[PDB]
Amino acid sequence: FEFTLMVVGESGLGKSTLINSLFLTDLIKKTVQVEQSKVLIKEVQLLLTIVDTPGFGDAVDNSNCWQPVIDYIDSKFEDYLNAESRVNRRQMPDNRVQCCLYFIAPSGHGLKPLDIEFMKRLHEKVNIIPLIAKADTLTPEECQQFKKQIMKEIQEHKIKIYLVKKIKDRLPLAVVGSNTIRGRQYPWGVAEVENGEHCDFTILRNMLIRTHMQDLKDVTNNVHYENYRSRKLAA
Amino acid sequence: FEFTLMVVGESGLGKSTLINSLFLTDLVQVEQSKVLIKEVQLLLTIVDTPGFGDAVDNSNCWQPVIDYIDSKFEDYLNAESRVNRRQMPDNRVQCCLYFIAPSGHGLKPLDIEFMKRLHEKVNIIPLIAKADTLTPEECQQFKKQIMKEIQEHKIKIYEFVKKIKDRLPLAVVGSNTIRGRQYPWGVAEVENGEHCDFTILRNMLIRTHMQDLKDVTNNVHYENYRSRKLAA
Numbered sequence A: 001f002e003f004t005l006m007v008v009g010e011s012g013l014g015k016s017t018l019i020n021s022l023f024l025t026d027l028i029k030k031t032v033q034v035e036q037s038k039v040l041i042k043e044v045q046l047l048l049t050i051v052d053t054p055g056f057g058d059a060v061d062n063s064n065c066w067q068p069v070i071d072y073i074d075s076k077f078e079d080y081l082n083a084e085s086r087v088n089r090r091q092m093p094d095n096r097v098q099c100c101l102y103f104i105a106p107s108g109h110g111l112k113p114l115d116i117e118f119m120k121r122l123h124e125k126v127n128i129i130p131l132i133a134k135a136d137t138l139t140p141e142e143c144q145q146f147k148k149q150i151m152k153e154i155q156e157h158k159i160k161i162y163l164v165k166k167i168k169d170r171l172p173l174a175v176v177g178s179n180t181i182r183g184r185q186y187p188w189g190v191a192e193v194e195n196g197e198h199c200d201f202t203i204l205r206n207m208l209i210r211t212h213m214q215d216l217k218d219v220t221n222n223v224h225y226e227n228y229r230s231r232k233l234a235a
Numbered sequence B: 001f002e003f004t005l006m007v008v009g010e011s012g013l014g015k016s017t018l019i020n021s022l023f024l025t026d027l028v029q030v031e032q033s034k035v036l037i038k039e040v041q042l043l044l045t046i047v048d049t050p051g052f053g054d055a056v057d058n059s060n061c062w063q064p065v066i067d068y069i070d071s072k073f074e075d076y077l078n079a080e081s082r083v084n085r086r087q088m089p090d091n092r093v094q095c096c097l098y099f100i101a102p103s104g105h106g107l108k109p110l111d112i113e114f115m116k117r118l119h120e121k122v123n124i125i126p127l128i129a130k131a132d133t134l135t136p137e138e139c140q141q142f143k144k145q146i147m148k149e150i151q152e153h154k155i156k157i158y159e160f161v162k163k164i165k166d167r168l169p170l171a172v173v174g175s176n177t178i179r180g181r182q183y184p185w186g187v188a189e190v191e192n193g194e195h196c197d198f199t200i201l202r203n204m205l206i207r208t209h210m211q212d213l214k215d216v217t218n219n220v221h222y223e224n225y226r227s228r229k230l231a232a
Ligand SMILES: Nc1nc2c(ncn2[C@@H]2O[C@H](COP(=O)(O)OP(=O)(O)O)[C@@H](O)[C@H]2O)c(=O)[nH]1
Pocket: A010, A011, A012, A013, A014, A015, A016, A017, A018, A133, A134, A135, A136, A137, A175, A176, A177, A178, B103, B104, B105, B133, B134, B138
């Protein structure tokens, strides 16, 4: 079972920490770059190509910093299109990005111009799961208000983001990534990762491992790839 | 007693909250708001920078700040050049609070570009905004990483006493109500030395340490501007 997961976000949002917490243990100029690392998990076979975006914030300039992401995604769509167009399609590789994790910087306030510009330009090319990075920065009052402010700005700009009722209620997911003994040690308290009262991490962790990836795999193949196919052949 | 304090930083770093905690109760473009405090007279013009992050583009987003600071230097220069200098106003920015986004890692290209371009025009106090985001281990490592990158790029931050130099740059948390922030696991106190460097910053202003900042701006920053604009 192969799966391609992309992570896009400003540097220092706990992106790499989240990956290490989702899957146990550890793992510039001129911008922007597109890199990938593969992870094999055995128990059951799991091929996991993780697409990093060594941009991205990050900061000045940032003009068309979404483009290298767009180029990579459409490149893999082009590869799949040319693969099934050949007379001898036998051993076909599938390197299309099934899922994309976008890390929104708190706070907050609303979505920053960069968050709007990326999501509005990538929502029809990849499955986007918006995440409030470093969720332990926000109080329960702020976290709730930040979610509603994001969701209203998503609807306003016509952005199409990707037990089911519990998922829609807590969108976008506020997440905290951590290691050791599991959470983060502050001199006043400890923020637990596997807690529902603390994080939406368990909601995200469940949304991947127990083969919800297959749903993401189907949407990418049936919607995102097919829209690319219809566009590049008509004109 | 008049004082001009500037605050520069990316939106959503708790800048406004810090001002409200430094001075009690509630409160690219360049805007300013005046605050009068009575007990002792305190005229406080707070220069906001409604930029700034924030994001794309950001090219020359430091320029409107530079333009404002040099404009006030120009006003002071033309004031003391006139034959009848009687009631002279002093609107020069005595201090600037720059909010560094955690984390961290090091300083972002924007943090470098601003500080290296404003350190000789204004007194810069670097601050690690929203300090409750970092653990004591991360907070200590983030400080050292910043200070080494300050020295590497030849940035001259306001360096004034031993307790102040030890904790540079100051990691601060701004809050209100009953004083700190309410998390479902713990509470981060503002007036605590174990938690914040807020008390170090609060003390560095209220008890007339502002007069030192006022002297450095007048004797160094303004005089360097004066020597530059007249020699050429
Ligand atoms: N407050 C907070 N800090 C975090 C979180 N995750 C990671 N960090 C810390 O942030 C720093 C940078 O994390 P990193 O994963 O490298 O960020 P990235 O470069 O965007 O992937 C590290 O010192 C982490 O300990 C989080 O969920 N909340």
